C-alpha cells in the first residue's frame, strides 16, 4: 500500500519513532518519502547483489535475510519479505536497530541526500497528530 503522508506520520508516532534516539518524527517521515515514496511494497536491487526492502528500504546484506545475498548478516534477524507488509511494525523495529548501529540516520541514503540538514518538521506539518 501507499501510505498517505500524515497517515504514516501518525503510524510512526504510535510506534514510538518521534524523537527516537533524538530523531524527531519529521526525520522518519522524510526518510520514508524519499526512500520508497511511502510504498510498503517498494523494492530496489543494489550493486553487491543485495536488495532494499519496504517503506524504509532495509538492505538484505546487513539487516534482513532474503536467502540470496552474499555476505548476509541479518542483524535485524528477520526475513526481508516480512518488511513488505501493509503494517509497518517489522520495518519500524528493524529501523530502531539500524539507527543504533553507530551512524544514526546516516544509514539511510535518501535521508542523507534529501532530509538531513533540512526543515524535516515540514513533513509532519498540517498533520493532526
Amino acid at each position: 500500500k501507499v501510505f498517505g503522508r500524515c497517515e504514516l506520520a501518525a503510524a510512526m508516532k504510535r510506534h514510538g519513532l518521534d524523537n527516537y534516539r533524538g530523531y524527531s518524527l519529521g526525520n522518519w517521515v522524510c526518510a520514508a518519502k524519499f526512500e520508497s515514496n511511502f510504498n510498503t511494497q517498494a523494492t530496489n536491487r543494489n550493486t553487491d547483489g543485495s536488495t532494499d526492502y519496504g517503506i524504509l528500504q532495509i538492505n538484505s546484506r546487513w539487516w534482513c535475510n532474503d536467502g540470496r545475498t552474499p555476505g548476509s548478516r541479518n542483524l535485524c534477524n528477520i526475513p526481508c519479505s516480512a518488511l513488505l507488509s501493509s503494517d509497518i511494525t517489522a520495518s519500524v523495529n528493524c529501523a530502531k536497530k539500524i539507527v543504533s548501529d553507530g551512524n544514526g540516520m546516516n544509514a539511510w541514503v535518501a535521508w542523507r541526500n534529501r532530509c538531513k540538514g533540512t526543515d524535516v518538521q515540514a513533513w509532519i506539518r498540517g498533520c493532526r497528530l
Partner: antibody, heavy 116, light 107 residues
Framework: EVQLQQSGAELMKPGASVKISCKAS????????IEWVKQRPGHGLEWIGE????????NYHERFKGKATFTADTSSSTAYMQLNSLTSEDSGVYYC?????????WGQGTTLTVSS | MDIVLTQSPAIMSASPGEKVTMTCSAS?????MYWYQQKSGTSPKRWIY???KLASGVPVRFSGSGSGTSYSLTISSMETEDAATYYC????????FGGGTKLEIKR
C-alpha cells in the same frame, strides 16, 4: 524437488500483448523471487526483471521497464510476465527461474514469435 | 548504467583431459560474478555463483575466480559433456550477461 513449468509457444502479431505463465511447485511460493530472462540468437541472454509472489514486489531491468509487467496468483502458485506493444524484436525464448542459496533451477522456456 | 561483459575466447575447442580457461571482463568493477552453462536446445543452468561457489550437480573439475573487472571459469580436465556455451553474469542493479564462450570438442 522444485519445478517451474512455463506455458507453450506463442505466435502474436505486432502491436499485441502476450502473457506467459510460470507455475511453481515444491516450495513456499511467497518466499522466493522468480526472475525472468530473454534469449535471442546472436544477442545472447538479457535479464528482464523479477517478482516476489505474494508481496507483489517487482524489480525491472532499466531496458525492460514499460515492456514487461510481472504478476502472480498465489491460489495456484503461478507467476506471469506480460509483454506489451510487441514487435519483431520481441521474438525469442523467455525463461522464468530461481536464483538463491536453496535452489536455482530455470523453467523450460517459452518461445515467442512476433510476425504478421 | 549498462555494465558490459566481454568473454574470451568467444569460441574455443578442447580435447578430453585438457585444461580449459575462459575469461569475462567487465567495463566496470563488480563485486561478484556468476556463470551459467547452456547446451543447444535446453535452458541455461546456473553453474557457479558468488564467483567461486559451485551450483548443485556441478563437478569439482570446475572452478571460478576473479575480482574487480576480471573473472574466469576453469576446467581442470575437460570431459566430453563439458561441451557447451558458458555465460558469465554480473548480478547487480541491472544484471547483464556476457556474450558467452562456446566450448567445443577438438578432434
Amino acid at each position: 524437488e522444485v519445478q517451474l513449468q512455463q506455458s507453450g509457444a506463442e505466435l502474436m502479431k505486432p502491436g499485441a500483448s502476450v502473457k506467459i505463465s510460470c507455475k511453481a511447485s515444491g516450495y513456499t511460493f511467497s518466499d522466493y523471487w522468480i526472475e525472468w530472462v530473454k534469449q535471442r540468437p546472436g544477442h545472447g541472454l538479457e535479464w528482464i526483471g523479477e517478482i516476489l509472489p505474494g508481496s507483489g514486489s517487482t524489480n525491472y531491468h532499466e531496458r525492460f521497464k514499460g515492456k514487461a509487467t510481472f504478476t502472480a496468483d498465489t491460489s495456484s502458485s503461478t507467476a506471469y510476465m506480460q509483454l506489451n506493444s510487441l514487435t519483431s524484436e520481441d521474438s525469442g525464448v523467455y525463461y522464468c527461474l530461481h536464483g538463491n542459496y536453496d535452489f536455482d533451477g530455470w523453467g523450460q522456456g517459452t518461445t515467442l514469435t512476433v510476425s504478421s | 548504467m549498462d555494465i558490459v561483459l566481454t568473454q574470451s575466447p568467444a569460441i574455443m575447442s578442447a580435447s578430453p583431459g585438457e585444461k580449459v580457461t575462459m575469461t569475462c571482463s567487465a567495463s566496470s568493477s563488480v563485486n561478484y560474478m556468476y556463470w551459467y552453462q547452456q547446451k543447444s536446445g535446453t535452458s541455461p543452468k546456473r553453474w557457479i555463483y558468488d564467483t567461486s561457489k559451485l551450483a548443485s550437480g556441478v563437478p569439482v573439475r570446475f572452478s571460478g575466480s576473479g575480482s574487480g573487472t576480471s573473472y574466469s571459469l576453469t576446467i581442470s580436465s575437460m570431459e566430453t559433456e563439458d561441451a557447451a556455451t558458458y555465460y558469465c553474469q554480473q548480478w547487480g542493479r541491472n544484471p547483464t550477461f556476457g556474450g558467452g564462450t562456446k566450448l567445443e570438442i577438438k578432434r
